């Protein structure tokens, strides 16, 4: 709608990587989702649900590593996709003992009751990704 700037609940960190603030309505939510639906790369990898923050990452297992395009969303999810092949490769399961760890500001795991995740953000912005997966943490469980 006129004056509506969706816009400006979404925070681009790179072409493929940004975080959206949470408080906008239903009705701004399914312009959001509407949006991504024609433009985002990823979409058809996420349920329908509107992708809060994505962003590559290495996630580390065995010697070394695989990147992949992790996607926080509604649900909430935390898909991740294998960026060149285009393929869901699988999700870290959601449950109440979540909880993400921040080494340094590449570096950050995902505690889940049976696998920790070990990812790697080369962009330094591990911190962001600890924040945002922590604030949906809290608004999916407390409040």
Known sequence: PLGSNIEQYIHDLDSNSFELDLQFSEDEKRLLLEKQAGGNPWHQFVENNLILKMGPVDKRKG????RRQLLLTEGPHLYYVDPVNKVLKGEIPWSQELRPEAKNFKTFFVH?????YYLMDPSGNAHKWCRKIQEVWRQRYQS
């Open 63 to 66: 010697l070394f590593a695989r």
């Open 112 to 116: 889940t009751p049976n696998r920790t």
